[PDB]
Write an enzyme that holds these catalytic residues in place. Sequence first.
Site: not given
Lengths: 48, 46, 101, 335, 146, 350, 33, 49, 67, 48
Positions: F18-20
Amino acid sequence: EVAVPDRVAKVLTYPEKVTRYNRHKLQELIVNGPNVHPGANYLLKRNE
Amino acid sequence: ATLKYICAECSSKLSLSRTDAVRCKDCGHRILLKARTKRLVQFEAR
Amino acid sequence: PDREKIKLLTQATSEDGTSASFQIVEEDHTLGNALRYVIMKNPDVEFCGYSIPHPSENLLNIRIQTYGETTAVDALQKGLKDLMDLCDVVESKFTEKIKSM
Amino acid sequence: MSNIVGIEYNRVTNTTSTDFPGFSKDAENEWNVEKFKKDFEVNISSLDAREANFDLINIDTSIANAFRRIMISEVPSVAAEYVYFFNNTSVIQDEVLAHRIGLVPLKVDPDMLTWVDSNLPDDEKFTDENTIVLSLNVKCTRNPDAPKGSTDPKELYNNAHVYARDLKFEPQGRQSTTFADCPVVPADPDILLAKLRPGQEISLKAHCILGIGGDHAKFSPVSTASYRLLPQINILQPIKGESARRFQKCFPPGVIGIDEGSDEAYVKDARKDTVSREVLRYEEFADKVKLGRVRNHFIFNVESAGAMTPEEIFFKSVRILKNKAEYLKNCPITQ
Amino acid sequence: HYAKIRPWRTFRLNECVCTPYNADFDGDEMNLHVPQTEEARAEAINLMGVKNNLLTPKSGEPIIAATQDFITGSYLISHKDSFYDRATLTQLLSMMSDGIEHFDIPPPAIMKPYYLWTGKQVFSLLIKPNHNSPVVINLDAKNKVF
Amino acid sequence: AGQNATVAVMSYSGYDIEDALVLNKSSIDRGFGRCETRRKTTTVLKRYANHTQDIIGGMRVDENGDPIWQHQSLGPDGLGEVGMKVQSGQIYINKSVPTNSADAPNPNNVNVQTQYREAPVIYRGPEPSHIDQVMMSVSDNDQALIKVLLRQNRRPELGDKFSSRHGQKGVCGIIVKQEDMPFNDQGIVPDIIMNPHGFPSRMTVGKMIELISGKAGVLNGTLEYGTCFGGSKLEDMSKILVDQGFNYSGKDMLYSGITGECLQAYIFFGPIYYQKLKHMVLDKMHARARGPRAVLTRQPTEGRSRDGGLRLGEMERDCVIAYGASQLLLERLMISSDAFEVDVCDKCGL
Amino acid sequence: EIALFKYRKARLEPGTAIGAIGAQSIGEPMNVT
Amino acid sequence: VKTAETGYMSRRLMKSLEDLSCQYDNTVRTSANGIVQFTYGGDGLDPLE
Amino acid sequence: MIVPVRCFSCGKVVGDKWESYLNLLQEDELDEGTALSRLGLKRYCCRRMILTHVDLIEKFLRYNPLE
Amino acid sequence: RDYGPQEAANAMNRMAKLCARFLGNRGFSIGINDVTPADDLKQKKEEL
Ligand SMILES: [Zn+2]
Ligand SMILES: [Zn+2]
Ligand SMILES: [Zn+2]
């Protein structure tokens, strides 16, 4: 598991009562000293 | 030069006596920086 | 010879060649993705594959599980000695053409 | 599968090497050598001093990719690392500017040094042949010749643009006579290390060590070393006529070409193409053309930082991987 | 959690456990509490630990599982279209466990025009890697967009 | 404000989710996304009604011509100096107050006004730093003033919020080396590499056009525009690429750095502008063993700065009750926070 | 065997606090309301 | 605006329900050892497993 | 600040060509894309930094000590 | 539900260490053309 950064592992400590099974770890684990990671910092004698 | 520090606008070499004045001898302009230390310093580029 | 490069894992071996798991300290895909390509085409070898346990740690786990007949370690010994000969040839044919240019 | 990769509009296909005995019912194509030697070949396109582009044919993806990786890292090189400032007033950070010299390449051939040792600090670390020290100092003064006001900020000043050219070399015992024929020069001579205006001066001597690629990019002997996998355009039906003329504009110019309207478009050459797969979006060309790249044939181009000739680079890059393999062989397996 | 020490600096959990925390990553912050007394530990990992609390309190429903990349990646292996080969498969069935394990390769799905193993196998062996792994399942289900 | 980073869109590693983000060594090391930071420490010097000036004198220097390491980083003046590396517990400005400052001034003295309590301000921080510039001046009311400012250049370490300027808000994952991650034909290596999943659920296609517009820009050599209800019309962007060899839509082939065989699906990348944010991690990491306690409650103080300790709220505290742990509370809200022995009296309890 | 085993195992295990789990269970997260 | 109300919802929903235990009679009882229920939900079966 | 000495991906040295770039633009007025090309950068990530990267160091040298 | 947790979490560990390392080595991405309507849904888009 939670991977933990060693740089908060140096300063965040757990108490241990060394008894009969732990020595040849711990009598060694002191000689590392607090700077290197796999080691200890504070020590408290039975003499309270 | 090698002496202590500098004005702001004068940008002039200024050495100060212990508890002398905060002014710069040349300009009436007050604030003063401290000039670079002549001492060695080490970086590692990486 | 320094005794820390290969360490045969006691835990994943079985008996009599066949399976085994070698961890190779101080390495990365650069070797394994090659070494296995030589290993897999060795007629006997069946299961040969590698992985890195965790990148912030530096280790190369490699797995050799073969048929009966010859042995786990003997496989990697051989195939490795083969991956030698490739590079020997690449130099041979290569530096020859570049000299003639 | 016939070592021709599938190219589609939405995907590729048939990637894996699949040469090995044991994926078929009839297991052939098992290793040995000769079956290899007398097969494998190599070609070359061009060699300049700081760049080479050549061709490597009939080996699989893996060990080639090994050459790419190991090449962009493991062939060691030499680049300035530690930096010692004798003051500095530059408007540029006394921090950053150090970083800059750290990166700039150097023309010197390795093997003239030996690896620095971790332990034995200070005086026992950097020793004689262990390090090439680089010296730089420049001061800027108002140029007494000042043709007109606010003209190009070069005439106005002395050396207001410092260049990598400025880094000199300081030899030592045994250090002079060994590089006497090969004096170190900072790679591409013209680079902006700093800009500064009169009243400002930089004096630094930076130790230069022998580093390894994967540790920092500044040790990469190669700017860019990679391999494009040779495209193969192949056609079905003559596809001739007018729209065949459109067909060549569909690709990058050289590519295929029209022989005659009746002689349609023969393939002039591959390897000019970027494998940009437009013929698939145009529909009507659909059934009569398919695209491919051959896993055996590696177009292989290697830059250079100027450190040494890329023929040397690719060459040593092999003997690393070899030497590594052997060093693994002769280390017995502990239990 | 059993703590494991690594370099850099940040708390690294395994993505599967992000959902209980509704952990979004992005920039959110955590709190790391060691216990102290010897019996609070055995209170923690044993009772309050992950494995035994793998489910949820209210619905008796799994709250930790594959999310985002893990689903789709698994999907792309499960995609009926896919195939593999004993080298590629062998390496997958390795990568799935970094080493350490004894795999018994089952019979390949198709035979003749080469050899292949369907994704349902390379993923099936995930469940029963050994012949000694005492995991035997069976089940029916409906994924969505049935 | 930002770096312009050449950025694939792919799932890689498995450190992504997630978004990383996932950054690039040998790139980040080439001067990508490097930060500096600047702090000021003001120390006002003030005269006291005893007519006694707080003095900056210093530099003890025992044992043959060198200051103690706890001191060092000063120079003869006792004030800090320019450009020298200062490290943790050292002193970047030496300061001492007079001891009698608040006493009753009398017209009686002979010898000693000179007893000083030296209370220098100590540097404390997880990293080194540098003293770039110091300022001695006088305030408006004519009282001495000293101001130094410290700097450090942070390498964009693991755990640092980046943005896409488009609403993507994420933290870098594993920093891969160079060799790894795709490359393709030119040889270029995508610098930032970004998780695909974010786009559909956040449903933002603006960026995913910005990538096209970017790759089209850098070829013609022209900054190419875009704007609200307007901007460069997408359908010509294709034409600029397709003749120059790159796919009519942003996608292109790539070779997984690990294996070295063609990536089985196309990938989509070009220049994107990723600005780097505050919330650098080296600020925000925090830890405590046993720290100071507030006088009133004698239980640990609050937040970063002062010293460690964290919050167990009644909103949270309940959690362990559901698990049913008694011993974890008694360790937690009892032993580990304020452990205390009260002596009471059975008879008439107090 | 399976069935009634899963039964005898699935029961209140005495000592669990069903109140707390109860609250934290309901906790998250024509015209009529 | 509303989540700030939900927090209070849970917190107070506890305080009346906060201590309710299942004793060894399978009779869930209060702090003061009254009895709110005899079996559990007519069942005796933990909803979790 | 100053043009970086290599791009952030390739590693070709861009430090040099920034001077020769701008000079080549002002004298000999010529369009961008054509300019950089015969300046010798085909790969685009090598190219952006020439094209991108406002040069601040001038605007930072107004403030020098001497004036 | 069958074998108890220590085996379950073992599975999921393998899940992670598979899907992770494989997904990149194969690759997946989005692109504009994927959100690009092509003919068709424009024709139905206007009329519908
Ligand atoms: Zn003055
Ligand atoms: Zn009493
Ligand atoms: Zn580049």
